[PDB]
Amino acid sequence: GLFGAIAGFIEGGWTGMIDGWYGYHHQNEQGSGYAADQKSTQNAIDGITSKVNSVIEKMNTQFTAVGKEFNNLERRIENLNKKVDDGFLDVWTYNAELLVLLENERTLDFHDSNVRNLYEKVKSQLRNNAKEIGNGCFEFYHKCDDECMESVKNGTYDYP
Amino acid sequence: GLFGAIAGFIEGGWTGMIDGWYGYHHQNEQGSGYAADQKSTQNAIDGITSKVNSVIEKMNTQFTAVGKEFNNLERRIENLNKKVDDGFLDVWTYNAELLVLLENERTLDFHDSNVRNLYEKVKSQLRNNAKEIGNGCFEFYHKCDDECMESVKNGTYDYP
Amino acid sequence: GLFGAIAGFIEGGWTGMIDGWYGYHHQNEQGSGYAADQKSTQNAIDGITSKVNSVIEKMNTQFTAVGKEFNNLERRIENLNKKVDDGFLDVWTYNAELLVLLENERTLDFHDSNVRNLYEKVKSQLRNNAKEIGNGCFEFYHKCDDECMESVKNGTYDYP
Amino acid sequence: DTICVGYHANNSTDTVDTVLEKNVTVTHSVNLLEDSHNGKLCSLGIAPLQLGKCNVAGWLLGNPECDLLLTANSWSYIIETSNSENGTCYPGEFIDYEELREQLSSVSSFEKFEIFPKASSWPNHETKGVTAACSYSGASSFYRNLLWITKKGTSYPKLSKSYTNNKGKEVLVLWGVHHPPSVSEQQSLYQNADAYVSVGSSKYNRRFAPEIAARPKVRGQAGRMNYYWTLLDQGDTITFEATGNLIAPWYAFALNKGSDSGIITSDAPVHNCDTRCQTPHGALNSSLPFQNVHPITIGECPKYVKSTKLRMATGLRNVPSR
Amino acid sequence: DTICVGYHANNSTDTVDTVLEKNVTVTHSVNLLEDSHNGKLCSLGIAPLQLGKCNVAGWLLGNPECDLLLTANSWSYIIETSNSENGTCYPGEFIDYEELREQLSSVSSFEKFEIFPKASSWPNHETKGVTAACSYSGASSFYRNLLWITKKGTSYPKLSKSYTNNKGKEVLVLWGVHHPPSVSEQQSLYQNADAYVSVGSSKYNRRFAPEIAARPKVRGQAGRMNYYWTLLDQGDTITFEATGNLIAPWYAFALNKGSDSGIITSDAPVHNCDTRCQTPHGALNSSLPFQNVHPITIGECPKYVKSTKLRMATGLRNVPSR
Amino acid sequence: DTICVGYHANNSTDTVDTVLEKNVTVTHSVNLLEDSHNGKLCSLGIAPLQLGKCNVAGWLLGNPECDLLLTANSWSYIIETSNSENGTCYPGEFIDYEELREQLSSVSSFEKFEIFPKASSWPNHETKGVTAACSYSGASSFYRNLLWITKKGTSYPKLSKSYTNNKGKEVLVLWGVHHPPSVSEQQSLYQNADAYVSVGSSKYNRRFAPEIAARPKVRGQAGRMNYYWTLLDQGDTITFEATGNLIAPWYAFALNKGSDSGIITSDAPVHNCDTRCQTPHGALNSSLPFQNVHPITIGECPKYVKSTKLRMATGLRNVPSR
């Protein structure tokens, strides 16, 4: 919600858009329907994948036995051990909990940014050839056939 | 400052707006004055509260005695103990110092975002019915009575 | 790429702008050329410097001998020691790897934000006195001499 | 007509650090660092054991200077002060002492009882075992919980007494072994030059010989005394056999160990306040994640940290503009 | 004609936590927390040693109840169950036991051999050393790997046997020292009241005396037995000399220690599945960074954590708003 | 006419990793990871003690091969090389050795002095105590700091010497106890078959018996020697009594312990450079937070990390696209 698009000025999502994360709708006299934007979806899929790999795999791991056995005259060194185990417990629990919380915020905001950026890429091409009717929609002043919609999606629009 | 609103294109803050974090000013022939936007303020108050709770309370804590007593022929194990205590000191000091620094940056940027988003929610409603005079102000081309201001704040404006 | 400017709607960078991080181009009948925006460049240089100092220097460091020597009947306490050393290895490796990854994302986004913000500072001054021709460029409707460009860079433009 | 968008400002002088900028004034903040303490030593639900002029050794053994103490019922941790010297008054080594201190640091039931009554248990032997090293009100005395058994005029017969644990708790039994400085002093005390002390239970078996050796005087004594202990299990039976040198148990303790804890050394006053976290300088009223009061604590404590400020912004950048 | 910009939604009910907001429904997520286990005890490439009704001591010594066991070849860790009591059957102390357990927890080659054959090595001495404490099928017996050497009718001559290590591995040698309850029992077993046991190698030298002392009966025995061990280096030579009380080595073990490991206590079933990470309740199929299954593990393990949920968003905020 | 907004680019090939993207070229960066070392062993303000062909034991005891050494004044840490074998030349156990090494690893004042002069202190006894095990230039010798006291023709009288510490520092006193292989060798060396060695001070009391036992030859010796030590407090008085087997102190050391440190094992050259952080391969010029040079260090060190690259962007994404 940091970029005001997802759940913001674009009020809802499309369950109808099954082939990707971000995309377009469009309505013609030749029909209508959904289409994902491959470039940004694939970029996001790629970025988020690197993110998950980083969190999962940058974790270094040493072969360790952990358990220790001390007799009833070694209580002090038994408690040192407990202190170590408990210390790492506290460190890992906290930084794990907060790592997920923080990365989760960042991830959702990342998606929000991609939607706002995509919306702006369209707005920028169309300029005053369409009117921003709100909710992420542009209404063309001219007549926009299938080849022309394809150009807006391509990023090829070309018209003052 | 990441979203250029707080301390940016809206140059300063209002000590006159006492009933919330973000809001409006407005000026009529029926007078003028401040008013907080309850929705975003409450949303921010909620979000920031969750943030503080997370940092304060996700911290797990184990009953631990910490002190150890070793005799003058147990120096090695005494230093192991010192190594453990000192190690956690270094870990906690660093990740605490940087956690505050990082979250602080994020919090301020969050507030900045909320102001820009609010400013855009207005801009978007008014469209060409008012002129952006800068510093977060819109000057109406028509005549805007109390009920009408209330509509802009409501998000109900309704007029081409 | 979070603010869609660097590598986005401004497609490329200028190797020709040697005196700073962000800046302007401009083209006259008196010639053309690059110029860095000193305020934002210096602000970024300052911010990023503080960032690097924080990461490098908030790190607390204790005098420690680390090495321990245990005989062949002290195997348990030798492994406790190994557990401690290995535990901090895992902690420091992870939080270091992820700290660089996360701060790197944030740094690049910071630069992106500064370019978008600078672009908007210009857009805001010029208003309808120039046309947004895309790629970060504005084309004046009037005639813009050196003093006048200097005014836009100054933030002094002044004209409806 | 107009409408402006804008944000809050106030007279706040709260200042926080960010990653890009230092000393940034904000409208609202919270402190994350506990940096002050109680000034007092408190309870953990339960109150601490105060030893005052004594230490754990002196307390357990019954140093004559510790009579005005006995306050044991149950405790959450032990407190020793900088005035805690009266402990082992007859010079010697207290075996596995740090270990015993650790295991005794939190006890949930603790009652002293007469394991071997001075009167009835040692016929054929003595009871003039006192020393100027362990003196009360000027006169020579001895530990209240131990008995210095000596020869009854010219003869120290092999002694043998046993105890069966029926307290339904662990029983802590302490005893001593005397090491005379010379071979002739071994004679005048316990007659038998070839002497031994033997303790035995289900999980304890040791023999001791008198380590007769020339050494310097400590507290006016060239002799030494070694202190030993053990935790007698319920239903078990410890057994004492000796031909000399046995500083026998007089009182033992029946106890219920909770979970371990610690000993704090501090001259801070003890109060009835309650706390989840205790440090030597005072208790932490702590629900914050970090503290910089003291690294060595007992309880559920904020993480010790070397920071001096960890202020976390909750409000926005404060820009009042006058 | 219209073109709209928009984002995906679906019937997902996945829910994640963010820093600003809780319980946020998202279109896609991954779990970062391993929170379930195998139910089984597995291999680490190699299989674990199961002791079953025995424990390490009983196994090594040859407690008569452990005959139906001997399955040693090589193992990655030791498993003991809650039914693991038959170990030291004759009461006494197993010296440096926890240490031996740790060093024996993962062995890469392990073969039992007859160090000193019962038949040929002890002429001039006995072989009726059995006890009701160590009994098989009702009859009194003794450890299978140790020999209770006693006097041959009225005479216990100074015995002296040696062994040179030629296995090309370390050899683990165990032995015992008997402590009679009385001075007369010392007589009827080993004649010589003044008795000693002496073990010696390149890096091991110790002498033992019989600690004759009155003590309670454990498993019907008032006597005690102390168990000792050592790791004999390749080419080295351990030597045994005694005038009584020697519970001699009969079998020793030649081994190759890998790197250390651990012992797990668990009643979970052993299977042939393979794992990189083993916990007492089961194995973790773990490639995730964190787990909350169990703090005490063996292998390459995700970090133990006290969380109950660590779901990480990959998708966007889901608002199906149809 | 047209003004443009834009950003810097250059010929930089610096490459950093982000959370979303790998191998991203940027205009400016800094390294956070120290990944190289000095090649040298340095000082910590103060210089290290080099033992060279000796080790701590051989140095302290005065192994005859360590004469060309004595360079003690004060040091920040000890260095041993892979050529450090001449230490305990007469076979035996150095008691609490690792502990002594740790406590001696950094000393701020250290002076050798003659505690008991060979000439004057032992009338009634010998001084032909040498051995082929401890030889110099082919001939049989002995430790320079210890005296092998033997019987003066057919008689070893009970010896008794004392020392009072007046150095105004702690005094480190070492001594030995000889364990002959046979009962007859105990005779020809110290006459008295029943022999004892007794050391005693304010906080040290021990007795030793000759553990006469058959064992293998090490360095041609079947006998053994146990080495002991203690830290004599200022004003205290250690006392030696013996009837044989005492390998007496000849030289002791008066020292001032600083704070503890460590021992590094390395064949790297020692130089006069200065460092805050020392590793076995070399010193780290380190003011960076992390290093991957070596886990085992002495001093104020960057955190050891298993990374190979920790490059932190300071500049922007470098996009020349021309």
Ligand SMILES: CC(=O)N[C@H]1[C@H]([C@H](O)[C@H](O)CO)O[C@@](O)(C(=O)O)C[C@@H]1O
């Ligand atoms: C009497 C004496 O001080 N030293 C002698 C030792 C010791 O008798 C043995 O080391 C005891 O085990 O033996 C030698 O064969 C040796 O080391 O060359 C001759 C040497 O003179």
